[PDB]
Structure formats: C-alpha cells, structure tokens
Amino acid sequence: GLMQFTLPVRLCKEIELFHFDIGPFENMWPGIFVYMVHRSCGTSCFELEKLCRFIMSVKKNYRRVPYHNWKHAVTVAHCMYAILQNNHTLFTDLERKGLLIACLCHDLDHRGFSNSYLQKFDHPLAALYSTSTMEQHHFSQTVSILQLEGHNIFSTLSSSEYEQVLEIIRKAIIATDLALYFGNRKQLEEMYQTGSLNLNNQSHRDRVIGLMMTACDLCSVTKLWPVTKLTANDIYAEFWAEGDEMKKLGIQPIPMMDRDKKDEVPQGQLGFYNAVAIPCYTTLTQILPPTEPLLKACRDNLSQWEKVIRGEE
Template sequence: MSSVAECTACLILRHYYFCFHQGEVAHILCQPIVQPDGTLAAVLELWRREAGGSFHEEDEEITCSYLVWGGIALHYAHLYFNMDKQRKLNDFLLAVVKSIFQDMVSMDMLIMKIMNFAQRLVDADRASLFLVDSKNKELYATIFDVGIENKTSGDDTESENEETVKAHTSREIRFPLGTGIAGQVAMTGEILNISDAYSDERFNRTVDQLTGYRTQTILCMPIYIRGSIIGVVQMVNKHTGCFSKEDEEAFEMFAVYCGLALHHAKLYDKIRRSEQKYKVALEVLSYHNSCSEEEFHSAVKDGIPGQVVDIDDYYFNPFVIEDYEKARQSIYMFIDLFGLVRFDKNSLLKFVLTVRKNYRRVPYHNWTHGFSVANCMYSIIKHSDNAFRPNECLALFIGALCHDLDHRGKNNKFMLDTESPLAAIYSTSTMEHHHFNQTVTILQQEGHNIFSKLSSSEYKQVLGLIKHCILATDLALFFPNKAKLNQIVQDQSFSWSNQDHRMLIQAIAMTASDLSASAKPWDIQSETVKIIFEEFYQQGDAERAAGRKPIPMMDRNQPEQQAASQVGFLMGICVPCYTLLYSLIPETKPLLNMCKENLEKWRQIDEDMRKREQ
C-alpha cells in the first residue's frame, strides 16, 4: 500500500476510535476503494451522527462514483512511490559502481568501500565481509567489522557530523565453512535474515566475544561470481527494527556488483603482482644477461678493433674467428658503416657484448648465426651503391645482428603446438616478435641505448624499421613479400622513391642474409647444414617425446632425407630469394651464384642416394 493509502487508513482509524470512545452513535457507510487491476487498495468509512440521519442509497451511488477515481489515484500514487524508491536504489547502485570501479586501489580498500555502501543501503550498524578460501575450505577476513561513525566537532579538518568509516578489527580472522551464520550462507548459498541472533543456534558468539560487540539482528547474503560463492556479506544490527524483505531485495542486487568488483579486484591484484614479478625478473635478467663490467672494461682496453681479412666478402667464413672476436668485428662493421659521430662508443660496446650474451647455446640459431647474418647484411650494404638510406642501413644491420636473440632452437609451429607461453603472447611470427622485444629490452638497459643521440623522430623511425626487418625473417612472411615484389618487378614499376617498394626490398634483403649459409662456399655450407640438422633433430626428439610424429626432415631416424630437403629448400626459397634480390641490387650476384652451385651439389648427392636405394 502506498503512503497515501496508509495515511488515509490511519485517519479513518483515529476518527473511528474518537467517535467510539465519545459514546456518539453514528451511521456508518463503508465502501471499498479498488484499483484498476481489481485489487483492493483501501476502505473508506463515513460516519454520520444520529441527528444527521442515516445514509441513503443515493449516498452510496455518489461515493461509489467518486471512489472509482480514488482507486485510480491510489494506484498511480502507489506506482509513483515504487518508481521513486527504485530510482533512488538505482542511483545508489550507480554511485556504488562508479566509486568501486574508479578507485580500485587494493583489495582492502575495495572491501572497506563495499561494507560502507552496504551499511548505508540497509541502515545497518556494522558490516562484515568474508572471502572464501576454497583450498582450505575456510572463510577469512582481514577487515571484517566496519562501522560508520560521526566525527566530533572538535576535528578542525572535517565538517561537523561528517560520517567516517572505521574498521573495528583489522587482524585476520579465519573459521571453517559451515561455522556461524556467515559459514552457513557460504555453504548453502541461502540468504539468512535473523531477527534475534542469540536465539538462533547457528549464530557463532565467538566474534562478539573477540570484539565485545552485541549482535542482535543479522542480514547475511552470499556473493557469487560465475556461479560460485566467493564471499559473504553480513549486515549487523539495523538501526530501526529488523531487516525487511525490501532490505533483502536491495541487498541481493547490491551483492551482484560486489561479486563483479571483488572479481576484478583480484584480477587487478594479480596483474599488479605480475608487474612487480616482471620487474624483478627483468632486474635479474639484466644482471645475468648483460655483459659484465670485466667484459666491458676488457673491450675498452682492447680499443677499436681493426678489420679482419675479407670481412666484407659475401663468402666470409664465420667459423675462423672465436666468439669474442665476432663481437669485436661486429663493432668494427658498425663503426665502418656509421661512424661514431651519432653514437656513443661505450654504449655500442655494451650493446654488442650483451647481444652476444643473449644468444642461447643451441646448435644453429646461436651467436655465430647472428654474427653471420649481420656480416652478410654488412656486405650487401657495403657493395650496394647506396641502395638503402642511412637509417634503413642502421635498422638492417642491427636487425640482422639481433634477429634471433634468445632463440630456443625450435620453430614457430613447435611453439604453437606445445602451447608455449611465447605463443600465448604472440599468435603470429611468435619467435620473431620475441627477438624484437629482446632487442628493445637490451636497448632499455642502462648504458646500452646506442640510439640515445638520435632525435625522437629518428629513434621512432629506426625502431619501427628494426621491427619490420626482424619480423621479415619469418619465412611465412617471405612468400607474400616475394610475390608482391616479383609482381612489381615483372610490371617494371619498381621505384626506389616508393616507400612500400623500399620496405619490400628490405624484407627480401633480411631473408637473403638470414639464409646466407646456403650461399657460402661448399665447405662452409656443408658444415653449417650438419649443425642445422642437429637442431632439427633435437626438435624432432622433443616432438616425439610429446607423443607427436616429427616430419621426416626433423626425424633423426631418417638421415637420408637431408639431401632431398636441401634441394627443396634451395629451389623453393633460397634461389628465388637471391634471384629477386639480384634483379634490384645487382651487386649481390655472388650470393645467387654460390647458392646455385650448392644446389647442384645437393642434387647430385640426392641422385646418388636414390640410386643406392634402388
């Protein structure tokens, strides 16, 4: 019944009480007030003193016609009352959501907010929020007893009577599921509205004994997320009377938002902890995977390296110099190409030494391979008559040097098939994205940023080009790149002034450098192939251990596949790559020539092997 109807009923009762006790004799006309839907809204009673005479049929008809409109009025008053009540509840819940999700700082702060809002919602004296520990089958809370108090007027910093939230208990409390009212709610999911706590056998008096507080009325409700109970909110001691059905309904709606907020707060805490763990891991990584002070000082003492014989030859043999000398020759090649005017020498030394350290000791994709690819790119740049612009050359050389950083000796398909964490982070070009990010990580280490003297626009351009160059080493991208560039060349529309065309030739140059072992003289080529297949076989072993059958090329039980696989690899990928590169940069012809020579030798080996098998 609406407040209007309630007031009408009250007036009738008061008048009836007065007339009865005054001893007056009255004639009574009683009529129902019916709402449009047929439900009884109220009852109207009219009294008339004896002198006024009795009510007539005409009086009944008149009052009946008026009361039709009275029923409609009461109906709309009732609707307005409910709508206004719902609007206030919605406004309150909106304020709750804004406050909870805008200021999500920590779980404890969120819990304080939830309990504060819950108290206001149902006019409770105290609030408790317990979270479910599913592993130990317990309820726990670090802040479980919160009340709203008025500040005294003696507080100069706040206005008089301002409400504040006070945590009466801030030590952790734990108890088994099923213990007390909250434990019962957590076990059953049932809402409990208790008007006398001490007369309820489920009530656990331990908390009162610990806090010195007297619990009288309780409204306790579960908090769900994804169908599971994650906590329990308990309101204690309504300020006026007992908790009503309306309190339950409003509180139940509020609990939905509590569940969402707690769920997101847990995610927020996990993310924040993960960030801190990442920072710690990065600190450890930067310490152990950075060049040591001894290595750096040794490189400084050794001075700027001189040129090794034939370092700019496409057929340079990377196996003739040891790892440290490879680092020194990488420094030489960088200085030879770019000088030191725009670059800090100490940063360059640290960067190259740390890059060397971040290549893993796998059979093929190791520091020797990284150096070889950089050496091939150095030779292309040196002999290509300024085909590439300065910042493009910088990105090509650094991209080549870093293109396989932290390679694990397994290909992208293996990472995806084994659901590697890297594959979860990068769904395409998995390892290549990782190599680029490792490059950026090294650049971000103190004293390693070789681009620190570049302008911000240059820095951004070079970093973008390095990413493009490293991603281009994914052979899955080679085929579309080759198809696009081939079409442009066939149409005789290639232009060095077209940025898209330049990006394509950069990608092809990166692939050519990455595959440069196939364009080395036969003794280097054959030795490198042995190393490549050892890495393939290690991946095949890992696949077999995981219950999968490796492809023949990666099956160490099928060594006879080596020659055939090399023929297919050189014909399908290497020769087309070097042919395309030669068509635009004629100075790279030695790469194409040697690749074709190696192809013929592998063909001969494959034919001889087939004849022996017949």
C-alpha cells in the same frame, strides 16, 4: 674517437666478400661487428662505450644452441654489411644503422624450436603472440636490451629518427619469419616485372628490406661448400631435437625433423634451395644487381647437393 678497429690483412680483405666466414674465435666476433658498423655507417654513429655494452648484452641473450646462436647473429649481420657496401647509395644513414642492429638481434633468445613447436607445445609465447611468435619475442628482447642503462646506442637520434629506426628494426626482425617470405617475394617479383617497383614508396622499401633480411638470414647456403655442409649439420641438430620433442608430444614430425629419415636430407636440401633459397637470391639480384655473388654461390651449393645424391660424395 680516432680509435679505428683494424683486422688482420686476410680478414681485412675477405670480410668485404659475401662468402666470408667469421671464424671459430668467438672473442673476435664483436670487433668484427664493430668494424662493420664503423666502415658501413661511420666511426661517429654510435658511442663506442655504449655499442660494446649493447653487443655484449646481445651476446649474453643468445643461447648455446647448435644453429640459432651468437655465431648465426654475426654471420647474418656480416651478409647485410656486404649488401649495404655493394649498394652504397641506395640506403639512408638510418637504414644502415638499424639494419646491422636488426640482424645482430634478429634471433635473440631463440630456444632452437620453430613457431609450430611453440604452438603444439602451447608455450606461453604462443599465447602472447599468435603469428611470428619467436620473431615478435626477438623484437621484444631487442627493445628490452636497448632500455638497460648505458645500452641506448640510439640516444643521439631526434625523437622522430628514434621511432623510424625502431620501426625499421621491428619490420626487419618480423620479415625473418620465413612464413611471410613467400608472399613478400611474390609481390616484389610481380612489382619488378610490371616495373611498378619504386624505392621512394615506403611500403616498397619495407618489402625490399624484408627480402634482404631473408637473404641475410639464409646466407649459410651462400658460403664455400665446406662451410655450407658443416652449417647444415648444425641446422639439422636443431630440426631433429624438435622432431624428438614432437614425438614426445605424440606427434609424428615432418621428415625434415625426423632423425630416422636422415637418408632424405640431400633431397630435403634440393627442395629447400629450389623452393626458397634460389628464388630468394634471384629476386634479390633482380632488385639489387650487385648481390649476384649470393645467387652464384647458392647455385654452386645447390649443384654440390646434387653431387651428394649421385653418390659423387
């Protein structure tokens, strides 16, 4: 109970910053996450014995894929931890509990393939879940791990607190379906400009939390340039693997996914930062001013990709 986690000084300090990289030492990532839960939620809110067993079962059910892996889970959790700490009073004790857990579990058992690829392959998961295929599977896996003996970190919540937090986690994980992001941000944009945004409206919170999940999920675009550049390699390793599999099914893949069209990556990133990342963090900064560092960082990286095209690296 009096068992704080501490981090080495540089981590202790840098972990509060949005642009923090969790490092190449796998074995520290659980302590990092526990540290985040304790400082964000309390040393009280989860029985340590149970959290650790949950964290290690979640690690076990991420696969050894280049991008959608255990490292991504904790990177995404970290970003949500930074947002919650810089917007202390805007969130309930329960939202803080469920959101860090939602981020850790949001890509559980990802196989390194898009919802589209499942649909054209005709994967059983596409039979069982027609939209947000991987995302409904990710939530399904979360509930599975929560139902293993000695794994229910939510044991101490009232029945109604319990349905609230599992409903936050479910909406949170579904929101990470980037197909849903576009409309969800358009509505938040419209609601913020016309000033009808109201954080006591539950349907309004849901949208705001959805955008936070999109923000946290893309936070590799908000790191120092060298982290962003090297993460971009990982994401393209999966994209091209998927393109190979599309060709294997007799389907010309979109260029993003074609390893022959590697030349066109820097323009691809421009499109992405402009169509997705920049608008995402803009609307998020508008709703939550303290998140501006994510927007500043995203812009630097957009500018870094512009330098790539102009042959300046």
